[PDB]
Amino acid sequence: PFRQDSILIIYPRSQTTLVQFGLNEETFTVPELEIPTQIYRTTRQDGSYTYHSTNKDNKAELIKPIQNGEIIDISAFTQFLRLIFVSILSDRANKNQDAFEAELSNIPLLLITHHSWSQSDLEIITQYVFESLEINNLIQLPASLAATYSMISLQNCCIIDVGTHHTDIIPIVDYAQLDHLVSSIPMGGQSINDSLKKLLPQWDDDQIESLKKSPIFEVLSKNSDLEFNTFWDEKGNEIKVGKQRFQGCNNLIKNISNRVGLTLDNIDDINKAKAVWENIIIVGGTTSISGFKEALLGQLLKDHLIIEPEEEKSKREEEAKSFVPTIEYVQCPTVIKLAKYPDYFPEWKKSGYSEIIFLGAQIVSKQIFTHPKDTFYITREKYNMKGPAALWDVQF
Amino acid sequence: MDPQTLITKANKKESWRYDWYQPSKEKYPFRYKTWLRNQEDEEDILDLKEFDRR
Amino acid sequence: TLNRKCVVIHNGSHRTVAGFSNVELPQCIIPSSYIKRTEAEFIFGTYNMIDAAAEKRNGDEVYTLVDSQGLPYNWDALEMQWRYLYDTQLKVSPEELPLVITMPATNGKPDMAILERYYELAFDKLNVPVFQIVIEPLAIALSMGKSSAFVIDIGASGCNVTPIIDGIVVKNAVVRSKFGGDFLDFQVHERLAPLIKEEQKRSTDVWYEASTWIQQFKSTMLQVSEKDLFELERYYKEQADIYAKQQENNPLVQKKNFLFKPLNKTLTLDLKECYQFAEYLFKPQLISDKFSPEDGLGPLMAKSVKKAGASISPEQVYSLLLTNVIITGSTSLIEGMEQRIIKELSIRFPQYKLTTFANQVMMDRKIQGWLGALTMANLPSWSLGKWYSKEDYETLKRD
Amino acid sequence: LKLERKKTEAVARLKSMNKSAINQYNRRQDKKNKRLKFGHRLIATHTNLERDEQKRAEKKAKERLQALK
């Protein structure tokens, strides 16, 4: 144990699910498999359910198991995992045919979880992985920790994970996710869309979405020099736009910031707190919008930095006209910083770090699965003894 | 091949249920759900490549 | 160990802590209060309330769940809170798992009436399978490897002093001070009032301020002086005169700076004014002429030990208690507090050697009550605690 | 008799609770340590990944800068 060919990482999210089977060994590659997170559920007279990849003869209903990051249908969710897992087996079993003795003989699974999943959901998933998929080794890695492990392993930090309809804020102290501080706001990328609809009434949804995803949309805090600029439709249609391309991100940025502030203010050990504020981690699709992260930082500074009020400072400098020492405050944060990205994953640098949580998982899985110690995953041994409850003896 | 048999041929053994349990000292008056071990007696495929990015 | 997983709930008078027995920290710490927003409607949770509070909307009002006894007094609201916890935080039917909850040490009287209201809530309403009630000072002490201890809990409602001898709680020596965290909030506010402009029904703003800047101020400005402050002052003065006179630095003149956010304004206190707030906990005769020095924490601790010596030698109980002093509670984390509680105890009992114990980890004392209940829930035998079942209720219901 | 019983019973209740409490506390500390230890190792793993990349990139640039195309 274990073959690197064999490591399987799954990262399921509301819209899609990133998947990878086998680690490259030279450098880590950005996940190439992206499967939409949904399954079809046919209902068979007599009550029971059947699950397929396609609307079978238009008889099945379309189930989207994960919504706003939460599992809303645990049965369709487990069926969706099986569907992924089986597909991978078939694919490899064709290509190579001796696969069941090699690449498919011992498949350890790392499943990236979301803060919102029940213990009940996590146990059921564990049961499913050991009983239905007949897999033997499982790590359930929280998304937040994947984040901090990718980010050159930070003991103290805050994860701001911007989704489409919600943003999660998750403080990490001493490599532990602080559950009672964790929260999400019902606000994300779509907010930008919505802000823009108000500013550009005569546009439609696809036009607005296209602007957001275009080279000329940025958050300010040379394109910025031009009054108007140009970009091209999804359907090739050229669209011109004024100052609106520097708008629409503000309401979201303010909401996130207000939340970050209330959160970090409830970290009880001020020495931990100082560290967290100095390692803000921002992740998610939205964050790839040029200027966004820096704009968000800018706002956290504007709202939360402990520093002398400018008027007060200006008086003191007039007074000294007749050198001014710095006023020291008892509060934190006096320093706010974004955590430093690792620049030595070439493939990741190339594609941006909106999905860096996955790199977290590539690193953890290699660590854990290419070393003897079985301290951080459930094994068959353990499953046989405690069952799904085995899960809680290997939490991080 | 049959998905179920693919699952069966890879990765090579108990089963648990989540059910009512009534502890004893004989038996306490109360119940509670837990993961109990069971006694002796107790669809499709998708094509990657569509989902591969290109 | 046992094949079970419990829900552990602690309803303090200020904070409520909830989570499962299988992990080291609680899933949630939320306020033991709620907003009633008006068709009525009930808001629970730290961010939900702070958001709603900042909205500053009429008709919004904050109400509490736990009286100053540390006991629930609004049981319709308590159910809504429990529902909220089980639905949105633990996310599990209350019917599945055993429940472990806390009560504060009492003199014994309110006990039966409470137990009944809990039956009604746990059974009639929620359908909980079975529950245990642990006594907070007792569990905290056990969680700390101690069977006998003098447990000094400084929370929001005041100080709660509880001698515990060989696993048993001495009820007649149970003592609850009236001055603690919430009191400190009032004083910080009244004193800073003129620098921040400011100088029930207006509960919403009182609450929001207590939960925001006032909380930060307490954690960063206040300190407890090691020795009676009036004496410290006379001394520091008497010394300062000599340094001055001698040639031809008084520590109380150090300044401390707090950025007050709502007005982007610096508030500066000298160290004396920082020491002053907690002095009230020790010498409450310094606010009103209506408080005797005996309502102060020092006399109170002493009173409770002496009432322990009356069991049912004294200079033995005295010796037991004083070699197992436990200092606990959110407010006990204010810098200088342990040392003053110790100095205050040591001088009322000079013949004896005091040894005190305290969780030094910031988080863990704030929730040490919940931590205590947690370590009860992980006890290896069902026989270690009284576990009330639906039965017990049935049988009490008879005549 | 019914006393010698009750007493030893009581003494053992306390003795065993104290035991569980001490064991639980040591388990906290252990989990906390194994956690901090895993974190602090990944930092080292990162450092090695970084050194390896640097060597790789350096060998690449070195050939690139002294050869066409």
Side-chain angles (χ1 to χ4, degrees), chain C residues 260-285:
Chain C
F260 180 72
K261 258 88 164 43
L263 298 188
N264 199 32
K265 172 191 202 127
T266 302
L267 313 179
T268 299
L269 297 225
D270 62 30
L271 181 56
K272 167 194 150 198
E273 221 72 49
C274 292
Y275 278 148
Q276 189 66 72
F277 296 101
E279 268 301 273
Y280 296 132
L281 301 176
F282 292 98
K283 295 159 70 192
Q285 69 276 19

Short mmCIF file of all heavy atoms in Angstrom, two decimals, chain C residues 260-285:
data_model
loop_
_atom_site.label_atom_id
_atom_site.label_comp_id
_atom_site.label_asym_id
_atom_site.label_seq_id
_atom_site.Cartn_x
_atom_site.Cartn_y
_atom_site.Cartn_z
N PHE C 260 -12.48 52.83 19.14
CA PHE C 260 -13.93 52.68 19.21
C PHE C 260 -14.47 52.89 17.81
O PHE C 260 -14.47 54.00 17.28
CB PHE C 260 -14.53 53.67 20.22
CG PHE C 260 -16.02 53.59 20.34
CD1 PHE C 260 -16.62 52.52 20.98
CD2 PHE C 260 -16.83 54.58 19.82
CE1 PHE C 260 -18.00 52.43 21.09
CE2 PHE C 260 -18.22 54.51 19.93
CZ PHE C 260 -18.80 53.43 20.56
N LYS C 261 -14.92 51.80 17.20
CA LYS C 261 -15.24 51.72 15.78
C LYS C 261 -16.46 52.53 15.32
O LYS C 261 -16.39 53.21 14.30
CB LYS C 261 -15.44 50.26 15.39
CG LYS C 261 -14.26 49.66 14.66
CD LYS C 261 -13.24 49.07 15.59
CE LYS C 261 -12.34 48.16 14.78
NZ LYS C 261 -11.97 48.83 13.50
N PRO C 262 -17.57 52.44 16.05
CA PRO C 262 -18.79 53.16 15.68
C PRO C 262 -18.62 54.67 15.46
O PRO C 262 -19.48 55.28 14.83
CB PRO C 262 -19.70 52.92 16.88
CG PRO C 262 -19.27 51.66 17.43
CD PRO C 262 -17.78 51.64 17.27
N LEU C 263 -17.56 55.28 15.99
CA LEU C 263 -17.28 56.70 15.76
C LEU C 263 -15.86 56.93 15.24
O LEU C 263 -15.39 58.06 15.25
CB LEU C 263 -17.47 57.56 17.03
CG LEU C 263 -18.84 57.65 17.70
CD1 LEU C 263 -18.81 58.68 18.80
CD2 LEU C 263 -19.91 57.99 16.70
N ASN C 264 -15.19 55.86 14.81
CA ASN C 264 -13.75 55.90 14.52
C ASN C 264 -12.93 56.80 15.47
O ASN C 264 -12.28 57.75 15.05
CB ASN C 264 -13.51 56.32 13.07
CG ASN C 264 -12.14 55.95 12.59
OD1 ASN C 264 -11.58 54.93 13.02
ND2 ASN C 264 -11.58 56.76 11.70
N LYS C 265 -12.97 56.48 16.75
CA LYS C 265 -12.49 57.37 17.80
C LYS C 265 -11.67 56.56 18.83
O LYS C 265 -12.08 55.48 19.25
CB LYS C 265 -13.71 58.01 18.45
CG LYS C 265 -13.48 58.82 19.68
CD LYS C 265 -14.82 59.16 20.34
CE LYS C 265 -14.68 60.40 21.24
NZ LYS C 265 -15.70 61.43 20.89
N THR C 266 -10.49 57.08 19.20
CA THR C 266 -9.66 56.49 20.26
C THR C 266 -10.17 56.80 21.67
O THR C 266 -10.47 57.95 22.00
CB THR C 266 -8.21 57.00 20.20
OG1 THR C 266 -7.64 56.69 18.93
CG2 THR C 266 -7.40 56.33 21.27
N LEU C 267 -10.29 55.77 22.50
CA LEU C 267 -10.57 55.93 23.92
C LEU C 267 -9.36 55.52 24.74
O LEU C 267 -8.91 54.38 24.66
CB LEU C 267 -11.77 55.09 24.36
CG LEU C 267 -13.03 55.12 23.49
CD1 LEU C 267 -14.05 54.20 24.10
CD2 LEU C 267 -13.60 56.53 23.36
N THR C 268 -8.81 56.45 25.51
CA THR C 268 -7.65 56.16 26.35
C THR C 268 -7.98 56.09 27.85
O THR C 268 -8.54 57.02 28.40
CB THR C 268 -6.55 57.19 26.14
OG1 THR C 268 -6.14 57.14 24.77
CG2 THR C 268 -5.35 56.88 27.01
N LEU C 269 -7.65 54.96 28.49
CA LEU C 269 -7.75 54.84 29.95
C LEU C 269 -6.36 54.70 30.57
O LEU C 269 -5.47 54.09 29.99
CB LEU C 269 -8.60 53.63 30.35
CG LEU C 269 -10.07 53.55 29.97
CD1 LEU C 269 -10.88 53.08 31.17
CD2 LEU C 269 -10.58 54.88 29.48
N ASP C 270 -6.18 55.27 31.74
CA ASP C 270 -4.97 54.97 32.49
C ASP C 270 -5.13 53.58 33.13
O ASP C 270 -6.25 53.07 33.25
CB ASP C 270 -4.68 56.08 33.52
CG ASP C 270 -5.77 56.22 34.55
OD1 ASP C 270 -6.42 55.20 34.86
OD2 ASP C 270 -5.97 57.33 35.07
N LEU C 271 -4.03 52.94 33.52
CA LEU C 271 -4.14 51.59 34.08
C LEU C 271 -5.08 51.52 35.30
O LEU C 271 -5.76 50.52 35.51
CB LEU C 271 -2.77 51.02 34.44
CG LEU C 271 -2.87 49.59 35.01
CD1 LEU C 271 -3.58 48.70 34.05
CD2 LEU C 271 -1.51 49.03 35.30
N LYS C 272 -5.13 52.58 36.11
CA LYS C 272 -6.03 52.57 37.26
C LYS C 272 -7.48 52.42 36.86
O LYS C 272 -8.25 51.65 37.45
CB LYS C 272 -5.96 53.85 38.06
CG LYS C 272 -7.11 53.93 39.04
CD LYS C 272 -7.23 55.33 39.59
CE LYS C 272 -8.67 55.63 39.94
NZ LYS C 272 -8.98 57.10 40.08
N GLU C 273 -7.87 53.18 35.85
CA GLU C 273 -9.24 53.14 35.39
C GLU C 273 -9.57 51.77 34.77
O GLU C 273 -10.70 51.29 34.87
CB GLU C 273 -9.49 54.29 34.43
CG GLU C 273 -10.84 54.95 34.62
CD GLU C 273 -10.92 55.76 35.88
OE1 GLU C 273 -10.01 56.58 36.12
OE2 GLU C 273 -11.89 55.57 36.62
N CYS C 274 -8.58 51.14 34.15
CA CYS C 274 -8.70 49.75 33.72
C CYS C 274 -8.87 48.75 34.87
O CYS C 274 -9.56 47.76 34.73
CB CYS C 274 -7.47 49.36 32.89
SG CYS C 274 -7.32 50.19 31.31
N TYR C 275 -8.19 48.98 36.00
CA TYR C 275 -8.29 48.09 37.15
C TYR C 275 -9.62 48.29 37.84
O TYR C 275 -10.12 47.41 38.53
CB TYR C 275 -7.23 48.43 38.19
CG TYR C 275 -5.84 47.89 38.00
CD1 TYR C 275 -4.75 48.62 38.44
CD2 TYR C 275 -5.62 46.64 37.44
CE1 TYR C 275 -3.48 48.14 38.31
CE2 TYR C 275 -4.32 46.14 37.30
CZ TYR C 275 -3.26 46.90 37.74
OH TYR C 275 -1.97 46.44 37.63
N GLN C 276 -10.17 49.49 37.69
CA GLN C 276 -11.32 49.91 38.47
C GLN C 276 -12.56 49.05 38.27
O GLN C 276 -13.28 48.78 39.21
CB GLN C 276 -11.64 51.37 38.18
CG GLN C 276 -12.68 51.96 39.09
CD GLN C 276 -12.21 52.03 40.49
OE1 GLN C 276 -11.36 52.86 40.83
NE2 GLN C 276 -12.72 51.14 41.34
N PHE C 277 -12.81 48.64 37.03
CA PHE C 277 -14.02 47.89 36.68
C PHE C 277 -14.18 46.59 37.47
O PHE C 277 -15.20 46.38 38.10
CB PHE C 277 -14.05 47.59 35.19
CG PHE C 277 -14.14 48.81 34.32
CD1 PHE C 277 -13.02 49.33 33.69
CD2 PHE C 277 -15.36 49.44 34.12
CE1 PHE C 277 -13.11 50.44 32.88
CE2 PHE C 277 -15.45 50.56 33.31
CZ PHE C 277 -14.33 51.06 32.70
N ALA C 278 -13.17 45.72 37.42
CA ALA C 278 -13.22 44.48 38.19
C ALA C 278 -13.16 44.66 39.71
O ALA C 278 -13.58 43.77 40.43
CB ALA C 278 -12.13 43.52 37.75
N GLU C 279 -12.63 45.78 40.20
CA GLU C 279 -12.59 46.04 41.64
C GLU C 279 -13.97 45.96 42.25
O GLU C 279 -14.12 45.60 43.42
CB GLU C 279 -12.05 47.42 41.96
CG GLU C 279 -10.58 47.46 42.21
CD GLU C 279 -10.16 46.59 43.35
OE1 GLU C 279 -10.18 47.05 44.52
OE2 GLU C 279 -9.79 45.44 43.07
N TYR C 280 -14.98 46.31 41.45
CA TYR C 280 -16.37 46.29 41.88
C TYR C 280 -16.83 44.88 42.24
O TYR C 280 -17.62 44.70 43.15
CB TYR C 280 -17.27 46.91 40.81
CG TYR C 280 -17.00 48.38 40.58
CD1 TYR C 280 -16.86 48.89 39.29
CD2 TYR C 280 -16.87 49.26 41.64
CE1 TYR C 280 -16.60 50.24 39.08
CE2 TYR C 280 -16.62 50.60 41.44
CZ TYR C 280 -16.49 51.08 40.16
OH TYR C 280 -16.24 52.42 39.98
N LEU C 281 -16.34 43.88 41.52
CA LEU C 281 -16.65 42.48 41.84
C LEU C 281 -16.18 42.10 43.24
O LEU C 281 -16.78 41.25 43.90
CB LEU C 281 -16.01 41.53 40.83
CG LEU C 281 -16.47 41.79 39.40
CD1 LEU C 281 -15.73 40.87 38.45
CD2 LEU C 281 -17.95 41.56 39.36
N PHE C 282 -15.09 42.73 43.67
CA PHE C 282 -14.50 42.44 44.96
C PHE C 282 -15.00 43.36 46.07
O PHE C 282 -15.19 42.93 47.21
CB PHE C 282 -12.97 42.47 44.87
CG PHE C 282 -12.41 41.35 44.05
CD1 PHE C 282 -12.07 41.54 42.72
CD2 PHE C 282 -12.25 40.09 44.60
CE1 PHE C 282 -11.57 40.51 41.96
CE2 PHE C 282 -11.75 39.05 43.84
CZ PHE C 282 -11.42 39.26 42.51
N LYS C 283 -15.23 44.62 45.74
CA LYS C 283 -15.70 45.60 46.72
C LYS C 283 -16.91 46.35 46.19
O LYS C 283 -16.84 47.54 45.92
CB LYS C 283 -14.58 46.57 47.07
CG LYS C 283 -13.42 45.90 47.77
CD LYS C 283 -12.15 46.72 47.65
CE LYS C 283 -12.21 47.99 48.46
NZ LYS C 283 -11.06 48.84 48.03
N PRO C 284 -18.03 45.66 46.05
CA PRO C 284 -19.18 46.30 45.41
C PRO C 284 -19.73 47.47 46.25
O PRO C 284 -20.55 48.24 45.76
CB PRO C 284 -20.18 45.15 45.27
CG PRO C 284 -19.81 44.19 46.37
CD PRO C 284 -18.32 44.28 46.50
N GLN C 285 -19.26 47.62 47.48
CA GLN C 285 -19.66 48.79 48.26
C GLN C 285 -19.19 50.09 47.61
O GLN C 285 -19.53 51.17 48.08
CB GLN C 285 -19.17 48.71 49.72
CG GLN C 285 -17.67 48.82 49.95
CD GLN C 285 -16.95 47.49 49.77
OE1 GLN C 285 -17.48 46.57 49.14
NE2 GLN C 285 -15.74 47.38 50.31
#
